[PDB]
Ligand binder design. Structure first.
Ligand SMILES: COc1cc2c(cc1OC)[C@H]1CC(=O)[C@H](CC(C)C)CN1CC2
Length: 386
């Protein structure tokens, strides 16, 4: 009866991602007080901060779960996430909003690394692990799909402080379940010590598996903060777009994540990721020819699809490689996965702008595209000798 544990991770990934998306319709409210890709720095400093902290706290957890087990960290991540929500409920200043974003990120990392660790440690059969993760990655898409709509409508219809408090209730409810299934009472270590991080980072077959996740995420991040939505002006026609502009990413991501998780193992898992990167590159190369906001609807759909097509396939491969070559402790490797997932958001907002100053912003897209395709063929060396 391991399935129920999986359920927990699903929630741990849904609510966590609902909070970051929920603040989307509230960002312009206290932000103010001709090209389509005008860049804003105030949003940029809001996008990286959370990740800039999550990247720092990612490795420190990988060792921790080797000494005090998986449950306790998860519980801590819940607690922190609740605190963050509360801080949000009374956050009235931009600085205070940045402080809440930092703690949130901490909690996020805790949940992501510990959850995945356990989720790989419980499902030891390779195909099973594959599909289970392919399911657990869906929670990210659901959080991206529900957090922007759920909030906006309620905020205006009921109250400015409603969308946090109500959501906080669910978080509190979630805590109850964590106390019934995980039982963080007794702290115990693992059986055998894990492989030192250095050693893993000295391996090419892991480096690639981390580069594949970084490139695609880096491309999507370089686009998100530079959108006409954040621009607050009376000349703006309507805010209907705000709260739905993140649909074409999440809707495509859920299908790709649950449709290849069981399918990739049928074909070559190496083949699934290659085509993924190539299709993400093709979709990004059409972003320059937008000329209108609706012109961004077609690319993002593919973008997200391919993102899923990569993440579903790459996430298990990390655990399979550690089992085939190193000690069977999964706590540290997935930490690497997570940092490879986050670096794109950690470095996008600044570098992007810097290039936008050097050359035109469409030129930046024409570059991050080609690199992706250039990185595509070397996913062939995914078959491993040991
Ligand atoms: C307002 O803050 C944030 C807003 C958003 C994101 C991050 C934010 O903060 C880092 C990412 C999250 C995903 O994983 C999404 C990945 C999709 C491709 C599935 C993309 N987007 C959405 C919006």
């Amino acid at each position: 009866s391991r399935k129920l544990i999986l359920f927990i991770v699903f929630l741990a990934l849904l609510l966590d991602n609902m909070l970051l998306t929920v603040v989307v319709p509230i960002i312009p409210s206290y932000l103010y007080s001709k090209d389509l890709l005008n860049e804003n720095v105030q949003v940029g400093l809001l996008f990286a901060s959370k990740a800039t902290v999550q990247l720092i706290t990612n490795p420190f957890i990988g060792l921790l779960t080797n000494r005090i087990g998986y449950p306790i960290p998860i519980f801590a991540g819940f607690c922190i996430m609740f605190v963050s929500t509360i801080m949000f409920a009374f956050s009235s200043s931009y600085a205070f909003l940045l402080i809440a974003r930092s703690l949130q990120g901490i909690g996020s990392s805790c949940s992501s690394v510990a959850g995945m660790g356990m989720l790989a440690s419980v499902y030891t059969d390779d195909e099973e692990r594959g599909n289970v993760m392919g399911i657990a990655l869906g929670g990210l898409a659901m959080g991206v799909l529900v957090g922007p709509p759920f909030g906006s409508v309620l905020y205006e219809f009921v109250g400015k402080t409603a969308p946090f408090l109500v959501l906080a209730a669910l978080v509190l409810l979630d805590g109850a379940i964590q106390l019934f299934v995980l039982q963080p009472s007794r702290v115990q270590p693992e059986s055998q010590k894990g492989t030192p991080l250095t050693t893993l980072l000295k391996d090419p077959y892991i480096l690639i598996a981390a580069g594949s996740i970084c490139f695609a995420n880096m491309g999507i991040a370089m686009l998100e903060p530079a959108l006409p939505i954040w621009m607050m002006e009376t000349m703006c026609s309507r805010k209907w777009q705000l709260g739905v502009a993140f649909l074409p990413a999440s809707i495509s991501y859920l299908i790709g994540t649950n449709i290849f998780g069981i399918l990739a193992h049928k074909m070559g898992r190496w083949l699934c990721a290659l085509l993924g990167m190539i299709i993400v590159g093709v979709s990004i190369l059409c972003i320059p020819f937008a000329k209108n906001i609706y012109g961004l609807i077609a690319p993002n759909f593919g973008v997200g699809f391919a993102i899923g097509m990569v993440d579903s396939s790459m996430m298990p491969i990390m655990g399979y490689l550690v089992d085939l070559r190193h000690v069977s402790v999964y706590g540290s490797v997935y930490a690497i996965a997570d940092v490879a997932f986050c670096m794109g958001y950690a470095i996008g907002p600044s570098a992007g702008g810097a290039i936008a100053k050097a050359i035109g912003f469409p030129w930046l897209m024409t570059i991050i595209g080609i690199i992706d395709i250039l990185f595509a063929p070397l996913c062939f060396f995914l078959r491993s000798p040991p």
